[PDB]
Symmetry: C2
């Protein structure tokens, strides 16, 4: 079977462990502070099949721009199709934030992350117009610091 | 002169670069991604004198526990006393989150960060009871990951 539920503080260990197991054994720079598991639980989820986690999503509603929801981090188990599980997580997140007054969802990725650019485009996200172009995609120069250009996604919901 | 204002997305470069100077130590693990400057602006502040930043505070209202406000990061110019600039940043933050319905404020630090433990204690924060003790302070073991013990502060407002 399958189920999706909101996260709890006790899920920290389980989720952070896969950051070392789902990305081909390559250490990710970005980490996930405990604060997300404690303060943005109602808009963060874990999907599973027969009590075994298949994916997760961490997100929240913008506070200074309430009509906007933000997806910070998500991942899908290697043995599962990225689109199916990922789509389920994004769909439940979207329905949840719509009930909070959000009319659009945002997130970001690196200009060289074609996997993410493809994934978000397939899900219907547009890209915000930045200041430079990288491989034909509009980008926000040094968005996350020097040499850290970012592609900003946005989807009306 | 002097002023206190809410942060804007464009303050990202200034704050992150100055912060590095204030520390004056070896490379620190990135803890301030751009998302904080874009989505929690009404509860994040910058203090300055003669157009030069003297301090900043990044915080937000908990979403899954609305009566709780959380301070993620704050810093004060080394040439300035913490209980002067810092107290001001914390007081403006508290006044702001009380208007959002918050009745308590939380934050965290490492049990070996005596500067932070002293500062928060002086401001009136209590420490939450964790699972172990480090240097006589109650701590939450591996709160931010393996080996990342944390002291959890809390104060009613």
């Amino acid at each position: 079977h399958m189920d999706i539920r909101t996260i709890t503080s006790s899920d920290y260990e389980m989720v952070t462990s896969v950051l070392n197991e789902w990305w081909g054994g390559r250490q990710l720079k970005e980490k996930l502070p405990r604060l997300f598991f404690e303060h943005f639980q109602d808009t963060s989820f874990i999907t599973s099949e027969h009590n075994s986690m298949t994916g997760f999503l961490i997100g929240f509603q913008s506070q200074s721009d309430p009509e906007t929801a933000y997806i910070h981090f998500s991942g899908v188990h290697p043995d599962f199709r990225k689109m199916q599980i990922g789509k389920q997580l994004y769909d439940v997140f979207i329905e949840t934030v719509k009930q909070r007054g959000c009319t659009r969802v945002k997130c970001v990725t690196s200009p060289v992350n074609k996997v993410s650019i493809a994934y978000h485009t397939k899900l219907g996200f547009d890209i915000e117009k930045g200041t430079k172009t990288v491989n034909g995609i509009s980008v926000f120069a040094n968005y996350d610091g020097p040499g850290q250009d970012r592609v900003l996604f946005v989807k009306n919901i």
